[PDB]
A paper describes a structure:
The [name] family includes several hundred members, all occurring exclusively in the Enterobacteriaceae, such as Escherichia, Salmonella, Yersinia, and Shigella, among others. Many of the basic features of sequences in the family of conserved proteins from Enterobacteriaceae now known as [name] (PF07338, alternatively, the YhcN or BhsA/McbA family) were recognized soon after release of the first E. coli genome sequence. These proteins are characteristically small, single domain proteins of around 90 residues; though one subfamily has three repeated [name] domains. Most [name] sequences contain apparent signal sequences that target them to the periplasm. The fold features a three-stranded antiparallel β-sheet with another, shorter N-terminal β-strand parallel to strand 3, so that the strands are ordered 2-4-3-1 across the sheet, with strands 1 and 3 parallel.
[name] and its homologues contain three [name] domains (I, II, and III). The final atomic model refined to 1.45 Å resolution and contained two molecules (A and B) in the asymmetric unit. However, the relative arrangement of monomers and the dimer interface are different from those of [name], and likely represent a crystallization artifact. In the [name]-III X-ray structure, residues in loop 2 and in the neighboring transition (loop 1) from strand 2 into the long helix exhibited particularly high B-factors and are likely to be locally flexible in solution.
Residue numbers in the entry:
A (entry chain A): 247 to 301, 305 to 314
B (entry chain B): 247 to 314
Amino acid sequence: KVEELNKATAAMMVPFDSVKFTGNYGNMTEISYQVAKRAAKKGAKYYHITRQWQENITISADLYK
Amino acid sequence: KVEELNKATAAMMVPFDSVKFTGNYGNMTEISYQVAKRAAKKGAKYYHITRQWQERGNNITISADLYK
Ligand SMILES: [Cl-]
C-alpha cells in the first residue's frame, strides 16, 4: 500500500520528509521494500527515490502524504 | 517472462552477457521494465542488477548480468 511515485508525479507534490540509509539488498524489489518500510514508519503514503549510490548501496527517498 | 533474480539465486548461476545503459529513472518499476526489455532483446530469461548510480535525481546508470 506504500508505493513509489514516478518523477513526473512526485514533481507536482511537496514532500514532508525524506529517508536516507545504507545496506546490502538482494534486488530492486528488496530496495523498494526497505524504502517502503521506512516510509510507512514515518506515516508516508508514497515515496520517490532520489539518490542511489554504490559503496552495499546508499538510498535517499522523499516522503509524501 | 523475464524475471529479476536476487543475490543468492544469481550467485549460483553463470551469466552469458550483461546490459549497461543510462536513462530516465522514473521509479523502480519503470527502470526494471527497461532492464527486462533489454534482457529480453538479448535472449535472457533472468537478470541480476550488478551496479546502479542515480546521483542527480533524473537519470540512472545501470548494469545487469543476463542469464538463460
Ligand atoms: Cl538474496
